[PDB]
User: Fold this.
Amino acid sequence: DFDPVQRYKMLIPQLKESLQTLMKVAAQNLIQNTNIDNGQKSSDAPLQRFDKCLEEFYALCDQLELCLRLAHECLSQSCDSAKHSPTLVPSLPYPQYLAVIKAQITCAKDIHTALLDCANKVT
Amino acid sequence: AAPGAPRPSNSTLVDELESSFEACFASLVSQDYVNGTDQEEIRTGVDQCIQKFLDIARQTECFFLQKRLQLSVQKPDQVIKEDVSELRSELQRKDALVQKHLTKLRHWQQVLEDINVQ
Amino acid sequence: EVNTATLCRIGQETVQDIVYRTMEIFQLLRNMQLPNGVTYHTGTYQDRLTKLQDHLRQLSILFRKLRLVYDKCNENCGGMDPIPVEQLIPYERREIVEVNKKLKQKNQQLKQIMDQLRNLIWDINAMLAMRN
Amino acid sequence: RLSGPQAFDKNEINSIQSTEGLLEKIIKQAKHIFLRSRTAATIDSLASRIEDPQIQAHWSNINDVYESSVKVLITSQGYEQICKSIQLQLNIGVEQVRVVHRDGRVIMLSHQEQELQDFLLSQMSQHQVHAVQQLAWQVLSFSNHVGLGPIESIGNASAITVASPSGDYAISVRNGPESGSKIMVQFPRNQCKDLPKSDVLQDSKWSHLRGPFKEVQWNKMEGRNFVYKMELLMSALS
Amino acid sequence: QPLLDAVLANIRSPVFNHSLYRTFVPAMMAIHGPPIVSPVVCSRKRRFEEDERQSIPNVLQGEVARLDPKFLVNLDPSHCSNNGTVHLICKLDDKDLPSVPPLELSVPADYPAQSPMWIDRQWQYDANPFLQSVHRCMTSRLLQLPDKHSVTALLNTWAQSIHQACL
Amino acid sequence: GVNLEAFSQAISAIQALRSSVSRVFDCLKDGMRNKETLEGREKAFIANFQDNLHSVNRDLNELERLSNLVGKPSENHPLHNSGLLSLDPYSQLLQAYKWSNKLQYHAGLASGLLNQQSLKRSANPQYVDDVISRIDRMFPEMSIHLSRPNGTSAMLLVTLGKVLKVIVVMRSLFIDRTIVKGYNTEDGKLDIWSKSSYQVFQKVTDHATTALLHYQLPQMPDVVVRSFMTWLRSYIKLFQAPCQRCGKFLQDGLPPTWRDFRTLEA
Assistant:
C-alpha cells in the first residue's frame, strides 16, 4: 500500500543489483562453456541457469515500467480535470458536480457529432 | 508498383481536393476509442493534412490562371467587358461615398449653425 | 453572356475563401474550452457553436459553387484547341476610353475635395491644440 | 524651485524658460510649407506612377504644433498580402523628415529629396514579386539589395536581383530606378542550340540543367501593375 | 562496472565460435519466440553490369554542362581517351570582338592542377596588334589564379581578359 | 506540476534500457561476421556496453526527479467510478477530456501552420477598446492606464519596471504614433510630443515605430496588441548582446526575433 514513487525508489536498486547478477552469471556460464568446449576441463562445478536471472530482471523492468505508467496516467488524468472544476469532497455539491459533468460530456459529444456530420456532408 | 515508370491518375483536382479536405479531418472525428495519450503524432498528422491541401489548392489556382491566359489570348473582349464593369462599379461606389460624405457634412453644418447661437 | 473571365476570377476567389475559412474555423476551434469550465454555461458555448455551424454551412456552399464553376469552365472548352499559352508566351474600345476619362475626371474632383478635407482636418487639429 | 529636490544639471535649468515671439510663428510657417511640399510631392508621384504600384498614404489625426505624423504603404494594385514595405515618416518643422522603411532604417531627407520614394518603389516591386513567388514557386531568399550592376545603377542604387524556380524552369527579374526596371529572363532546360561533343560522352544525357537565357521580352505581356508576374509563373505545368 | 562480460568476450580469442550460440540462443529463443524474426526473403545477385564504357571523366562533363551558351568547347584529334581527357577548342562567341580559340589541355579531372596549354601562341598572337595586347595582360592575370579550374575558371578568365584588354 | 515530462523521460529511459539489453544480448549471439584484418566486433561490444551504462545512469538521474506523488485522489475525478455503483452504469467523461485536449492541440498546430495562408487580396466601436486594454494590462509588471484626453484617441501610457514609460497613442484600433521617454513624463495636464532622450531612447522609438508598422495584420487587432505588448515586454532586462559585445555602442537593442542584440548589426 505504498505510493508509486516509493515503489519506484525501492525497485531501482533491486533492478541494478539484478543487472549486476545477470552480468556475473552470464560471464560465469560463458567462461564455463568455453573451458568445457575449447580447452581442458577446469570448471567442474554446478553453475547457475542464467535464464532464471534474465527472466527475473525482465520482470523487474516490466513491473517498474508498469508502475511508472500507472503514475503517469494518474497524474495526467488528475491534472486535466483539476483545471476544469473546483475541489468538493469529504465548495460544491456532488449532484451538481455530476450534472455538470454530464452536461459537459453531452456538449462535447454534440460538438463532435455536428463536426463529423458536417465533414461527411461536405463530400 | 507505382514508384516505377507508370503512375495512374484521373478524375482529380476537384474531388481530390474535397477528399483530402474531408479526409485529413479524421484525426478529430472517429467512432473509436480515443487513446489516453497524444504526443508528436497529431503534429505529423496535421503536417500532411495541411501540406497536401495547400499543394492541391495551389495546383487549382495555377489551373485557373492557365485558363485565364488561354482565355485572354483567345478572347480579350471578355476581359474588356470585365474591366468596363469594374470601372462602372468603382464609379458607383465613389458616387455613393461622396453622397454619404456630403450628407454628413451638411448635417454637421446644420449642427454648427444651431450650436453657435452663443 | 459568357463572363468566363469573371468565372475564373470567382473560382480563384472561392479557393482563397475556402482556405481562409479553414484557417478561421481552426483558429476558432483552438480557443474552444470545456463548456462547463468556470461560468459560461451555454451562452458563449451556444454562440461559438452557432458561429461554427455558419462557418461550415458557408464552406459547404463554397464547395458547391466551386464544383459548379469548375464544371462550367471544363464544359466551356471552346476555341484555341492546342492552347500552348503555358509554353507559347513571348520570349467597344471607345466606350472603355470614355469610361476611363470619366473616371479620371471623377478622381480629379475627388482629389480636389480631399485637399480641402485634409486642410480643414489639419487646421482644426492644430488650432485646438494651441488651446490654454 | 523644483531644482532643489530634483537637482537637474542643465536640463530643467534651461527648460524652465525659453525664447518665443517671432521664432515660434516662423517655425510654424516652416512646418506648414514643409507639409504642403511633402503632400504635393506625394500627390505628384502618385499621379506620375500610374502603371507602377500606386502609392498608398494615410495621414494622422494628431497633428501637433511643430511635429506631425504621416504614414504610407506601397500596396500594389489588388494585393493586400504584398505589403512588404510600409514606412511612417514625421515631418518636423526646423529639420527634415525622419522616415523608417520597415527594418529600423532611419534616415534624414532634404528639402527636395524624393528619389528615396523611387528606390523604395523599385525594391517594393522586387519584394512583391518575391512574396508572390513565395505564395504560389520554390523561391529562395536571395533577393539582395543590388549586385554587380545591370544598368550601371543610375537612380540611387535601385537594382533588384531575385529569382525563383517553380518546377524545372526558373525565372529571374531585375528592376531598378526606371533604368531598365522591366528586366525579366526565364531560362528553360531544353532548347535548340547545344553541343553534343562532350555531352553525349556524359552518361544519362543531361537534359535537366537550364542554360539558355531566352529573355522574356516584356512587350505586350499581360502585366497590369507588375503584380502579374504570377500570371506568367502559372505557365509551369498544366 | 560489470566488466566481466567485456573482459571474457575480449579473452575469447580462439577461432571456434559455437559456445556463444549454445550459451545464449536457448534463452533468447525461449523468451523471444519468433519463428521468422525477419520473414522478408533475400536472394540477391547484386551486380549485373555497371559501365557505359563511353564516358570521359565525369568531373569535366559537369563543367561542360555548367558552361554558358556563349562558350562552346569541342575536341580536336584527341590524345585524350582517359588520362589527359581534354584538349579542346573553345571559341569565345559573345557580343564583343572574337578571337582565336586556345587548346587548354587539362590533367585528370580530379584537378590537383589547372588546364593552361598555350599552343597557338606563336603565330596567332604575334601577327595582330590587338591579339598581341590580348595575350599580354591575360598572361599576367592567369599568373594570379591560385589553383585555377579547368573549364569555368580558365574560360571566364580568358573572356574577361579578352574584353578588358579591348578597353 | 511539470512531473509529466519527467515521467515520460523515465518511461523512455526504461524502454531504452530494455532495448539496450536486448541489443547487447542479440549482438553477443553473433561473432565476428567478416573482419579479414582484425576483429572489430570488440568496438561494437564496448559501444553497446557503454550504451547500457548510459541508460542505467539516465535512469538513476531521473530517479532524482519526481519529488512526491500528492494526494487529492485524481482531483475530483471519482464521481461515478469510485462513487455510487448506479452512477457508473463513466468512460464518457474521460473520452471527452482526451478528445478535447487532442482537438485543442490539433487546431493550434493547424492554425500555426496555415498562418501562411494563400489569400490573394481583400476584394470581390469605442467600447471594446477599454476591455482589450484591461485584458492586456492583466499581464504582470505591465501596469498601464488609458486617459483619452482629446477625442476618441486612446492616449494610453505604459511602464514596466523602470521610469522609461512609453506614451503609445492609438486610433481605437491599429495603435500607432508611439514615443518612448525615460525618467520623466506628462507636462501640464496631458501627454506630450517631447520625445526627449539621451540618444538611446531615440533608437527605441525608431524600433517601436518599425514594430507598429510591422505587426499590421488584416484583422484581429486584439491579437495584434497582445503581440505588441509581449514584444515590448522583452525590454525589461537590457543585459544581453549576441553577435557583438555588451557595449559595442552606447545602446544595444533590437529584438524582433525575441533576442535583443547591439544595434547596427541587423
Summary: DSSP finds three helices and no strands in chain B. The radius of gyration of chain B is 28 Å. Chains B and E do not touch (no CB pair under 8 Å). The helical segments of chain B are 15-23, 42-74, 76-115.
